[PDB]
Design a binder for this molecule. Structure first.
Ligand SMILES: Cc1cc2nc[nH]c2cc1C
Ligand SMILES: Cc1cc2nc[nH]c2cc1C
Lengths: 346, 346
């Protein structure tokens, strides 16, 4: 793990320079394709990409797990939904499944701690049957967190070896917006009220209780904002940990990772905190309809591409952005050049 | 033409109701897929769609033309670029060509007034070799405008007959951001300064001259804001007219049209002014990096899906959004239902 972290590669400045130059000579006014150009340069800097914006196979990794904090009345979805929805992922009827199929990506469902019997078809990396209730203690032990990071990290890089070049990250876990908010509050220093959202349709009247629960989690655990693993293990969850581990794994493999929404933003804060070297490999997707979204993105210094008011999770946002990435590549590779058209601009 | 306008169908409220109901029962928390749900309902209301969000063939219509206002020093791109780039459209090396191929759409290049010899391969609907210099008189005659609207309108609906169900609109014309701004100023009532942009990299120092030119166009022509055809013929251009005509044609055929950027917004203002019935068929794509973008979108009451800081035009933005439309359809049709999972939510 220390190793892993130490071995995350820096972006290739030379490939990025060549990229920029090539982009500038394309059949268009310089800088006219904006963020599409920026994205391309960004991809070119990623070592696992072989010095050019490329997209081979794509995968969406969905980390599933239950949370003890559910018992605090913070989520209106029945607890069983995690297990149910996880099974559905195997059938391709879920939102993420549908969107991923549309993007030509494959969905990997990972059980990191669902409180139910094992689901055949799902990758088993179960830590425990649900995590601890952050309201009265830690979500898990530091050890547990590090082990899972490690394990997920490896699974992630191993995929690279099978042709995957683009990852998408997501989750599934009733009550997960609670630990997400607590993390955000901690890393960001925002008061709970400012970051606590409606999650999966929590009635406005139940909001207040959700805020108190977050403050309690923090008060009791005293997570150290300067230590991402500490924060994750205390007020996080197994699914939060898994997502962070996907990020670490893709970075180590020098590959790009598309974020999803709020939950993913929390994970991303943790990752960057643990290893700043991770930052350049992250790509935002959409702008989540969760209340704490703006705060979390500001701290990541990220501006998503899509404004869809989505708040489903599962990695559905990450899948929806996949075509944008491929577009940046197509632009780079298939557009003709000014010079060939004998076009001269000031 | 009066006919045409009179025959634009109203959206099907019954199909939209059935749509909403179906969406609400999907394997997700109600309203969780946000704008994707809204988009689906919107498509379901379109008569040419057969009561459900569907996407058959897709086409991007690019309206090309030259403007006399170029002689006012408002554009740094050489004038010839229109003709050159138009030819390139036939070769598939352009930005729009590249993005459309990526979206599985076909590009239709339409010459509505390029100041050059005819380009083989391009659909010829040339009004004249470039339009009049709006700075000292009208762009064209009212007659000319109405004829082109009519002609483009028909071409557009005829495609529907060949299986096209989704249109994308775009342009190509050096100096076109000038007439675009003048139109915007007129329909919107904003001062020129607030709507005049850099266009294709116009140096900041040359800005001022661009603003004066817009004020002059308006002063001299006295276009009637309450008459879209009047505005178009006076301070518009043949390409602006063509784009408006695509909109009218798709509406009449009860089909959806994806807008592009700034130039398209100007056209859309005109269309809605001419026929409010057109509004429900319009779908924004991205948020253009042109200065007058926010003003124009506000008046259309539209919020684009993509924030890419693009300013290339050609309909490249419209093509990039095509997959979002298909995503909304996939969502509708392929997601499973709560009831089948025995999931019950409050
Ligand atoms: C090369 C070129 C391509 C374009 N496409 C639209 N406007 C354009 C302007 C230039 C200069
Ligand atoms: C059905 C359902 C699906 C979900 N996917 C993510 N969170 C969810 C919550 C519910 C209730």
């Amino acid at each position: 793990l220390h190793a892993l972290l130490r071995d995350i590669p820096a972006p290739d400045a030379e490939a990025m320079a060549r990229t920029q130059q090539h982009i500038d000579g394309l059949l268009k006014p310089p800088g006219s394709l904006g963020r599409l150009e920026t994205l391309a340069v960004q991809l070119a800097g990623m070592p696992g990409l072989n010095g050019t914006p490329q997209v081979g196979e794509k995968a969406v990794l969905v980390m599933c797990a239950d949370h003890g904090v559910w018992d605090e009345g913070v989520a209106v979805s029945p607890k069983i939904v995690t297990a149910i929805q996880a099974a559905n992922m195997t059938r391709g009827t879920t939102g993420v499944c549908v969107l991923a199929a549309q993007a030509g990506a494959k969905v990997h469902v990972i059980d990191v701690g669902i409180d139910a019997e094992p689901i055949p078809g799902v990758v088993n990396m179960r830590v425990a049957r649900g995590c601890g209730n952050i309201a009265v203690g830690p979500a898990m032990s530091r050890l547990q967190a590090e082990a899972l990071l490690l394990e997920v990290s490896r699974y992630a890089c191993d995929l690279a070896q099978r042709g995957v070049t683009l990852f998408g990250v997501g989750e599934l876990g009733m009550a997960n917006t609670t630990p997400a908010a607590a993390m955000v509050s901690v890393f960001t220093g925002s008061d709970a009220k400012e970051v606590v959202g409606i999650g999966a349709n929590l009635p406005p009247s139940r909001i207040d209780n959700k805020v108190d629960v977050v403050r309690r989690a923090i008060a009791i655990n005293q997570p150290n904002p300067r230590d991402g693993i500490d924060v994750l293990s205390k007020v996080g969850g197994f699914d939060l940990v898994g997502m962070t581990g996907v990020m670490l794994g893709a970075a180590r493999c020098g590959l790009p990772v598309l974020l999803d929404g709020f939950l993913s933003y929390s994970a991303a804060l943790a990752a960057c905190q643990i290893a700043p070297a991770v930052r350049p490999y992250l790509i935002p997707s959409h702008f989540s309809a969760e209340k704490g979204a703006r705060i979390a993105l500001a701290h990541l210094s990220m501006e998503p591409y899509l404004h869809m008011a989505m708040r489903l999770g599962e990695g559905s946002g990450a899948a929806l952005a996949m075509p944008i990435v491929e577009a940046a590549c197509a632009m780079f590779h298939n557009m003709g050049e000014l010079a060939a058209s004998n076009i001269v601009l000031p």
